[PDB]
Amino acid sequence: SFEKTPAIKIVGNKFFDSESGEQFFIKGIAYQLQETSYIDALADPKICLRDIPFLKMLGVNTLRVYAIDPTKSHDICMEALSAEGMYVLLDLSEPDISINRENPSWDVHIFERYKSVIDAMSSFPNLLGYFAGNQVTNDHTNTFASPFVKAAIRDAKEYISHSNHRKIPVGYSTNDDAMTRDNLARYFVCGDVKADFYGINMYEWCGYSTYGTSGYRERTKEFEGYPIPVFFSEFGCNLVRPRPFTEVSALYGNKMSSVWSGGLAYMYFEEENEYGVVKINDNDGVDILPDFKNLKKEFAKADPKGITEEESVECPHIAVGVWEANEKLPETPDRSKCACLDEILPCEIVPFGKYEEYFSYLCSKVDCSDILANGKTGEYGEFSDCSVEQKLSLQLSKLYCKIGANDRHCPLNDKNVYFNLESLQPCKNVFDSIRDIT
């Protein structure tokens, strides 16, 4: 039963309870513990059922979760959250499968991860939204990663649209770098593809600050009229402790409630970074920290005055060293096309420092244009959406064919290289593409 959490929908630049029609404001906290490299607390009832009572005391209605394991069940925890009126904002990526901001790709491997999370989590009415990326671009040196994130938003949205699932919105979470902030926010609502909502990591308010002096007034004037819901994906600067959380009074106050859809405190668990409101002891029990009462009191005080439901933008121009995100986006990764490489290529490589070494080597012998992806120029190779191993295998196979010894000896020395016997057996279009490529 999900009665206490009606699905939230988006109308204009606001969230609304789909049953009541009242504006929904996020009063949230980040909930993530640091087998899989990440820990999925929502897959383990002994963890989530310990914490929900404290989350209830805090007064939160939303958790932000950075990584789930899609191979595990989540209904116990999601139902337990619903019973307390709590929703989940969830990233689609995980640290080891996270668009690489320094070497960006939007490919079948990352897309498969995204689909897996969508198929694991979309049945829950209290799944508020998905993040298709989190601070990928983070300064003026890696703005070219943003077209890859936009492609991911488009493709996650399309995958959801074509699925039988409720049309859970797909958004983006960004940092607060002064040089890139404005351009990023415009980019994610520009042209033909838009984020559904937008979260900003917001640490401008530290200790006993004010609306005017923190920078909140400037950010609020900045986002006034923004076409999609906007909120703080993180808040809780820890410069002064115990954190007063007096920013909460401002965020849900009259001047900010008309622009922002609330925010999520960072974070629940105390870990090496010192941002918790609770600490898990040696006995796996919850010890409440000095911050907890302050957040609780502020959330309890917060009463945002909302409206009721009944009541294309130009992309930033390109400038070298300032903004290098092309409006033109990578294509939707094509699992079938890429899977036909596994079938027809003579020389294959099992997944692995070696990528950079081997691409350097192979791309000195054959033309790697077909696997390159350039977010600055909007030039994306025909097989740039395949997995890194598929891309490497393509180049190795091209070299094998160029040598033409046809002796089943693949021209790269590595235990991970093998000749593909399936290649000898008598995907038609991909074959034509690859046969053409030789």
Ligand X SMILES: *[C@H]1O[C@H](CO)[C@@H](O)[C@H](O[C@@H]2O[C@H](CO)[C@@H](O)[C@H](O[C@@H]3O[C@H](CO)[C@@H](O)[C@H](O[C@@H]4O[C@H](CO)[C@@H](O)[C@H](O)[C@H]4O)[C@H]3O)[C@H]2O)[C@H]1O
Ligand Y SMILES: OC[C@H]1O[C@@H](O[C@@H]2[C@@H](O)[C@H](O[C@@H]3[C@@H](O)[C@@H](O[C@@H]4[C@@H](O)[C@H](O[C@@H]5[C@@H](O)[C@H](O)O[C@H](CO)[C@H]5O)O[C@H](CO)[C@H]4O)O[C@H](CO)[C@H]3O)O[C@H](CO)[C@H]2O)[C@H](O)[C@@H](O)[C@@H]1O
Select from 33, 83, 206, 288 the one that contacts ligand Y (CB under 6 A). 206
Binding segment for ligand X (CB under 6 A), chosen from 27-35, 109-117, 283-291, 405-413, is 27-35
**Torsion angle in degrees (nearest 10) through CA of 377, 104, 229, 213:** -90
Pairing state between β 417-419 and 347-349: antiparallel
Residue 227 interacts with which of ligand Y, ligand X, none, CB < 5 to 8 Å by class: none
Q: Is 37 in the site for ligand X (CB under 6 A)?
A: no
Select from 203, 216, 235, 383 the one that contacts ligand Y (CB under 6 A). 203
Whether the CB-CB separation of 371 and 381 falls below 8 Å is answered with yes
Q: Is 247 in the site for ligand Y (CB under 6 A)?
A: no
Largest CA distance in the chain: 77
CB nearer ligand X, residue 61 or residue 233: 233
Binding segment for ligand X (CB under 6 A), chosen from 133-141, 314-322, 332-340, 372-380, is 133-141
Binding segment for ligand Y (CB under 6 A), chosen from 89-97, 206-214, 351-359, 416-424, is 206-214
Select from 48, 63, 120, 136 the one that contacts ligand X (CB under 6 A). 136
Binding segment for ligand X (CB under 6 A), chosen from 265-273, 287-295, 343-351, 404-412, is 265-273
What gap in Å lies between CA 361 and CA 397, rounded to an integer?
13
Question: Which residues, numbered 107-136, are part of the site for ligand Y (CB under 6 A)?
Answer: 135
How many residues are recorded in the chain? 438
Q: Is 98 in the site for ligand X (CB under 6 A)?
A: yes
Select from 49, 239, 300, 313 the one that contacts ligand Y (CB under 6 A). 239
Compute the least distance from the CB of residue 284 to ligand Y, in Å: 27
Q: Is 100 in the site for ligand X (CB under 6 A)?
A: yes
Give the binding site for ligand X (CB under 6 A): 30, 32, 34, 66-67, 91, 93-95, 98-101, 133-134, 136, 201, 234, 266-267, 273, 275
